[PDB]
Every structure is written in structure tokens, then in C-alpha cells.
Design a protein around this ligand. Sequence first.
Ligand code: 4G2
Length: 145
Amino acid sequence: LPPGWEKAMSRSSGRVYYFNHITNASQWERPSEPARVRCSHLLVKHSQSRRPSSWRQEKITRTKEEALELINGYIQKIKSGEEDFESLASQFSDCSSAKARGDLGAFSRGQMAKPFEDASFALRTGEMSGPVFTDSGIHIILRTE
Ligand SMILES: Cc1[nH]c(-c2cccc(Cl)c2)nc1C(=O)O
């Protein structure tokens, strides 16, 4: 199985699934290193972010755990096809990258916060992370190239 990926048992269903401890991705389907990758992300900041401020809201008051709830909801809507990643990022990301549908451009190792970087580099093109925690807040990351 590729980097980060492990088999787990579903506690609701009893079926095996796969989890990635690097990107916090999880899926039923069995899965599945570049010098640069290109990603977009959606950031939900909280009261404990390094700067609890954004273009959406001057003073970010939500708790870390309320932020995780928002992230989980967005992942649901992306996975169900109810909303697409780009649209939720444009509307709801606390990163200024929201204005470019969450697109950050290409980057190499040594540039991003390590949890983000490691998540980005362990995704394959087209793959989406689960909740990824950094000092900025909580991200969902989409590897586009
Ligand atoms: C507004 C913003 N974006 C990011 C960011 C953007 C891309 C990757 C990572 Cl790790 C963090 N941090 C912030 C912040 O204000 O802390």
C-alpha cells in the first residue's frame, strides 16, 4: 500500500477500509515522490489559530472543535457531490487563496508548514486529504498536479 496508507476495520459496518495517517484520508476502496506538487486548500481558522482573523471575519471566535465540525461537513458535501471543492473554498476558506478557488500553485518541500507539506506530498494527483491541522487552522487539501 502506498506511503501513509493502512487497513482498518469499520466499527459501524464490519467492512475493512483504508486510512492514511499522513493525509487523514479514509475510503472503502483499496489505494491507489514528485519534486513539486500543485494543491488547493480550504482553511477553517479557529480561536487558537496563529492569527484568528480573515477576509471572511475580522475576529475569528469559533473553537477548534467547531472548526473540525465545519471541515467534516464540507468533506461530506464534496464526497457526496452535493458541492464541489472549488465552490466551498471560494465561499468558506479563511485563506486569501479562496479568491482563486483555493489554488496555491506549485511548491516544493521546504516551503509549507510541515503537516500541510507532508499531506500534500502523500496525495496523488486528483486526491483529497481529510482534516489536516496546522497552526493556521484546519485544512482540506486537494492535489491537482
Ligand atoms: C491565510 C493563511 N493561509 C495559510 C496557509 C496557506 C497555505 C498553506 C498553509 Cl500551511 C497555511 N495560513 C494562513 C494564516 O493566516 O495563518
